[PDB]
Structure 1
């Protein structure tokens, strides 16, 4: 289920984070603008940029905490508020987070593994709803 999936992802988080974030940027090339430093790079080049591995793993570190603190795939409002309020998310709208979770669910569906892809899909929708409620455009 969802909680086991948190444990699975955490057991190889650096590689899951990079592969899911690459799936996101490759599915939605326009999203690299938020990361202008990732333009004109192949997957292998990106996985050799310090900020790429460091920042992507920190994104998923916090994403797993938010997933872990959720009840029935509904995140804490306090977690939503942190994500809306972070200076690094100044630019963003809910659509950015929706696209990331579409890529994450697709990744899970295409993997050989028994991820509860349906729970992650609900988690993404519930996080987008919570981000809107916490004042993301």
Structure 2
């Protein structure tokens, strides 16, 4: 289920973080303009960039903590507030996060592993709602 999925993902953290982020960037190539020097590079070129692995892991580490602190796939409002106020997230909108969770859910459904994809979809929708309530446009 959702709780065990967190453990599954944390158990192969680097690989899942990179695969899911790349799935997002490839499903929605427009989203690359939020990042520096990701344009014009294949997945393997991105994975070999300095910062890329470090960044993707730090994002994914926090996403798993937010999922782990949720009850019934409802994230804590305080976690949403932290995500809204981060300087690195200024100018983002909830649409950026909705697209990330669309890509994550699609990746889980296409995977050979048995993820609770509908719970991740609900979690993403509840996170989007919490981000709005916390002030994200």
Give the structure 2 partner of residue 41 of structure 1.
41
Give the structure 2 partner of residue 112 of structure 1.
112
The separation in 1 between residues aligned to 2:10 and 2:104, in whole angstroms, is 15
Question: Given the two structures, how large is their TM-score scaled by the length of structure 2?
Answer: 0.99
Matches within 5 A, 1:18-37: 18-37=18-37
Give the structure 2 partner of residue 134 of structure 1.
134
Note the alpha carbon deviations across 1:72-130, whole angstroms, 9 max, x for none.
Answer: 00000000000000000002000000000000000000001110000000000000000
The DSSP-based 3-state class of the residue aligned with 2:112 is: coil
- Stretches of 4+ moved more than 3 A in 1? none
Q: CA deviation at 1:36?
A: 3.1
The separation in 2 between residues aligned to 1:128 and 1:71, in whole angstroms, is 16
In the alignment, does 2:59 pair up with 1:59?
yes
Give the structure 2 partner of residue 80 of structure 1.
80
Q: CA deviation at 1:135?
A: 0.5
The DSSP-based 3-state class of the residue aligned with 2:16 is: helix
Note the alpha carbon deviations across 1:39-90, whole angstroms, 9 max, x for none.
Answer: 1110000000121110010000000000000000000000000000000000
The separation in 1 between residues aligned to 2:124 and 2:55, in whole angstroms, is 20
The separation in 2 between residues aligned to 1:11 and 1:74, in whole angstroms, is 23
- Number of matched residues? 137
The separation in 1 between residues aligned to 2:129 and 2:84, in whole angstroms, is 12
The separation in 2 between residues aligned to 1:22 and 1:82, in whole angstroms, is 24
The separation in 2 between residues aligned to 1:42 and 1:91, in whole angstroms, is 27
The separation in 2 between residues aligned to 1:131 and 1:50, in whole angstroms, is 30
The separation in 2 between residues aligned to 1:36 and 1:116, in whole angstroms, is 33
Instruction: Structure 2 unaligned segments of length 5 or more: list them.
Output: none
